[PDB]
Design a protein around this ligand. Structure first.
Ligand SMILES: CC(=O)N[C@H]1[C@H](Oc2ccccc2-c2cc(C(=O)O)cc([N+](=O)[O-])c2)O[C@H](CO)[C@H](O)[C@@H]1O
Ligand SMILES: CC(=O)N[C@H]1[C@H](Oc2ccccc2-c2cc(C(=O)O)cc([N+](=O)[O-])c2)O[C@H](CO)[C@H](O)[C@@H]1O
Length: 152
């Protein structure tokens, strides 16, 4: 099982930064919408749904400390969860060798500068286990970072 970010090097585990582009000005009452499907894609390394991969997001995924007061919802694989995650999410099965954009979006309610360019916004933890043998479990973290400032 592997992923990449913006079509970069392949990632089988560990921590990767994901740089996103945000609306530079938002009004009070407006949320930020971070569509991570535009950035993170994953695939099965055999193809043909051989040794199918089972992927979920993990309880404890959270805002960066500086944004701890913010409110959020996380969309994953057809279901929406409150954020920070207080449960694991549903499982997405991955079996094609062609990269699948992750069905992942973050909606953020800020509670001046809303987001600073270059600062970590959120940390999303992801778990993989496959089907055959031990399933070769792997842990990933996606550290979401803004490319630009957002003001309100
Ligand atoms: C031991 C293991 O992981 N086995 C998995 C297997 O993995 C590969 C199969 C063929 C070619 C490369 C890999 C592979 C690629 C990467 C990477 O590019 O980052 C990292 C690792 N790794 O972490 O060892 C392995 O894929 C199947 C189907 O996806 C299941 O996921 C299995 O469980
Ligand atoms: C389980 C959990 O919620 N928190 C633990 C956290 O787990 C992860 C952290 C990042 C990415 C994936 C996982 C993970 C998710 C699952 C799953 O979704 O079933 C299963 C496993 N697992 O057993 O290897 C790992 O690991 C830390 C230790 O580094 C502590 O143990 C925490 O308590």
């Amino acid at each position: 099982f592997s992923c990449n970010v913006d079509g970069g090097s392949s990632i089988g585990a560990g921590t990767t930064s994901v740089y996103v582009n945000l609306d530079p000005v938002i009004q009070p009452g407006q949320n930020l919408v971070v569509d991570l499907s535009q950035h993170i894609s994953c695939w099965n390394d055999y193809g043909g749904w051989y040794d199918t991969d089972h992927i979920n997001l993990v309880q404890g995924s959270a805002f960066a400390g500086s944004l701890q007061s913010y409110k959020g919802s996380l969309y994953w694989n057809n279901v929406t969860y409150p954020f920070p995650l207080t449960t694991n999410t549903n499982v997405l099965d991955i079996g094609d060798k062609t990269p699948m954009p992750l069905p992942l979006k973050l909606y953020i309610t800020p509670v001046g500068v809303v987001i600073k360019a270059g600062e970590v916004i959120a940390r999303i933890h992801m778990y993989k286990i496959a089907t055959l043998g031990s399933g070769n479990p792997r842990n990933f973290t996606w550290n979401i970072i803004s490319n630009n400032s957002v003001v309100m």
